[PDB]
Design a protein around this ligand. Structure first.
Ligand SMILES: CCCCCCCCCCCCO[C@@H]1O[C@H](CO)[C@@H](O[C@H]2O[C@H](CO)[C@@H](O)[C@H](O)[C@H]2O)[C@H](O)[C@H]1O
Ligand SMILES: CCCCCCCCCCCCO[C@@H]1O[C@H](CO)[C@@H](O[C@H]2O[C@H](CO)[C@@H](O)[C@H](O)[C@H]2O)[C@H](O)[C@H]1O
Ligand SMILES: CCCCCCCCCCCCO[C@@H]1O[C@H](CO)[C@@H](O[C@H]2O[C@H](CO)[C@@H](O)[C@H](O)[C@H]2O)[C@H](O)[C@H]1O
Ligand SMILES: CCCCCCCCCCCCO[C@@H]1O[C@H](CO)[C@@H](O[C@H]2O[C@H](CO)[C@@H](O)[C@H](O)[C@H]2O)[C@H](O)[C@H]1O
Ligand SMILES: [Ca+2]
Ligand SMILES: [Cl-]
Ligand SMILES: [Cl-]
Ligand code: NA
Ligand code: NA
Lengths: 461, 157
């Protein structure tokens, strides 16, 4: 291909030093710049929401002697906005003149210095935003009229969800980060190295920008807690201006999108947000690279499992009207449920049934002997399981079922006492009516409780 | 403990066709098993049989007092050992045996209640047939469970 960049030209007439690399200017002048001009014109439909109501676009680079025209127009019946042109420093070079009919605010300028580096402004500063949807066609021209954000393709993949802190509403994950992006200003000329590839290893895009003193697409994991353990870190740059970043990492992230209210029947969102650290006007995320399986299927492992992974490009505001790209890889998860209903629920059931079948007995002495004894087994079992249950400072559904379960088992002891007295007073057919009396209201209440909670916690009621 | 160590040279792909050497030293390991079957399995057994020999009794009153009491000892023991057992968020085979073990011990309490009422209704030779009735299906079920798991978890079935 053709190649690009800047050069130093030494021209010599009867001067053998010039072919030796040796340019010191001397003598009488013989040469210079050799010859409407070339024109460049651009469309863009700009949009002005409540969010974004001033907008500026840096122009790219006019020669002394170049003329610049720009025109705005309303898409619907939206108001005629304020137009102006300005240098990079903000000193004004023109203003918009609203036209003969009053439909287009046009502006004009031709160029003074050997660099004119112009900036176009359009504002909807004039009125209160009524529904925040007035949008404009903007025409622009000199005689790629606007200098555009270079386009980065980002990719992410997770290998291990290695920690979840349920109390502090955060988690930890191991994964792989790739950004690939074509910027000519990066360009390596080959004869220096003697290679196609230049490598920077073990440092942060930020640090390499600082070393090179140029702009690069730096980023941060948005909710990062403390430090990240990054290995196989690297950034590759070819001659072309094609560049790539590769980083396996192990990061700890705050996710207060946790809700543990329906534990263990809760489901959760692990979101891995990757924001840039430079605005939309310099770099933006343009593609998603499916460089590997996004979520890595080791299934035996099992503690939290994965429903679906959706990873997506979105632009978010930051300070100084920093609007910048954000690459959200967000895993959907649920707990391993066999662990809960087998280890917790099944046994619990049995403890509750023991209290219900001792109502059959009619030897209230013994009914109460077992009733009381089984309450201890309940409490006993309730702290067997207290380990896999986490302390948060608020009630999960399980904690809710468990209180009710205990309360019903304690009242069987209370009822059993009641009936034993009745037995020894010789109203034993009262106490036998009671026996069969409970036998049916009582497991009816467990079942109704459950229905209550399912509706209370699961059904948008 | 270590079963064998095999260490080996192999080349794997990386960034921009980086194909590079990898030196894998890979140890094979197993747990110290005496610790498990002595500390966990042997005692558990004993708790299991206590429930089976109280089926012999035919004083269902007392059968049930021991039956119930021994369930607590089971739960008690099950959390003695809860320390050396690690919380993962999913069932290991031990966790599997332990649930089944507890469930069978809870139904002895349930059966013991059943038989006691039968006794006081004066169908005591029903309840005595039951006694000998379990005595044999019940430790048959532990043994079949075990066979089930060995096949479920160990034998590529
Ligand atoms: C919802 C699906 O629920 C899921 O499916 C089965 C149901 O037993 C289990 O998964 C399965 O895993 C391995 C696969 O070799 C087997 O050894 C195990 O016996 C089997 O049951 C999971 O533990 C459970 O979480
Ligand atoms: C209105 C009162 C109706 C009572 O109806 C009667 O209740 C008692 C216990 O409550 C039941 O209980 C019955 O079953 C169990 C057997 O496991 C035994 O204790 C005995 O056969 C009897 O008590 C009867 O099967 C039922 O016919
Ligand atoms: C003192 C105020 O106490 C406050 O009121 C009620 C208790 O009645 C609770 O609010 C409520 O939470 C959920 C809403 O998802 C309901 O399903 C629940 O039945 C109810 O108790 C609050 O979490 C508590 O903090
Ligand atoms: C129905 C068939 C009954 O079958 C019968 O079960 C009982 C156990 O309960 C056994 O019983 C035997 O062992 C114990 C001794 O410690 C006692 O209960 C009993 O005196 C003895 O005969 C018999 O060996 C068996 O023949
Ligand atoms: Ca929250
Ligand atoms: Cl409790
Ligand atoms: Cl248990
Ligand atoms: Na984990
Ligand atoms: Na907290």
């Amino acid at each position: 291909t053709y190649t690009t960049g800047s050069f130093q030209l030494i021209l010599g007439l009867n001067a053998p030093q010039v072919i030796s690399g040796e340019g010191e200017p001397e003598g009488e002048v013989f040469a210079s710049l050799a010859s409407k001009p070339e024109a460049h014109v651009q469309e863009l439909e700009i949009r002005l929401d409540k969010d974004t109501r001033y907008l500026t676009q840096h122009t790219r680079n006019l020669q002394p002697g170049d003329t610049f025209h720009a025109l705005v127009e309303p898409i619907g019946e939206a108001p005629l906005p304020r137009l102006r042109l300005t240098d990079s420093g903000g000193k004004p070079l023109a203003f918009g003149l609203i036209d003969q009919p009053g439909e287009s605010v046009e502006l004009n300028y031709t160029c003074d210095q050997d660099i004119c580096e112009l900036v176009v402004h359009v504002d909807g500063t004039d009125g209160q935003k009524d529904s925040g949807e007035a949008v404009y066609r903007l025409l622009v021209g000199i005689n790629s009229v606007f200098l555009e954000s270079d386009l980065v393709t980002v990719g992410l993949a997770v290998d291990q969800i290695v920690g979840v802190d349920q109390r502090s509403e955060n988690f930890s994950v191991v994964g792989t980060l790739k950004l690939s992006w074509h910027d000519p200003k990066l360009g390596f000329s080959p004869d220096q190295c003697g290679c196609t590839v230049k490598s920077f290893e073990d440092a942060s895009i930020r640090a390499v920008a600082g070393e090179i003193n140029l702009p690069l697409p730096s980023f941060s994991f948005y909710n990062q807690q403390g430090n990240r353990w990054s290995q196989n870190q690297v950034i590759f740059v070819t001659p072309d201006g094609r560049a790539s970043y590769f980083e396996r990492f192990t990061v700890t992230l705050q996710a207060p999108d946790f809700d543990f209210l329906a534990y263990p029947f809760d489901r959760q969102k692990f979101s891995i947000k990757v924001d840039l650290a430079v605005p939309t006007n310099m770099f933006i995320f343009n593609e998603i690279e499916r460089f590997q399986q996004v979520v890595g299927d080791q299934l035996g492992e099992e503690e939290w499992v994965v429903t679906s992974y959706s990873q997506e490009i979105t632009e978010v505001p930051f300070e100084r009207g920093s609007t910048n790209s954000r690459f959200t890889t967000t895993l959907l998860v649920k707990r391993n449920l066999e662990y809960y209903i087998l280890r917790i629920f099944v046994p619990l059931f049995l403890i509750i049934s023991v209290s219900w079948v001792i109502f059959f007995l009619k030897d209230y002495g013994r009914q109460l002997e077992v009733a009381s004894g089984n309450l201890l087994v309940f409490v006993a079992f309730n702290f067997t399981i207290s380990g896999d249950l986490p302390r948060l400072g608020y009630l999960t559904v399980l904690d809710r079922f468990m209180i009710v379960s205990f309360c019903l088992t304690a009242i069987v002891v209370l009822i059993s006492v009641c009936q034993k007295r009745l037995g020894a007073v010789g109203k034993q057919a009262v106490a036998a009516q009671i026996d069969t009396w409970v036998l049916v209201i009582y497991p009816l209440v467990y079942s109704l409780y459950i229905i209550w909670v399912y509706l209370r916690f699961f059904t948008d009621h």
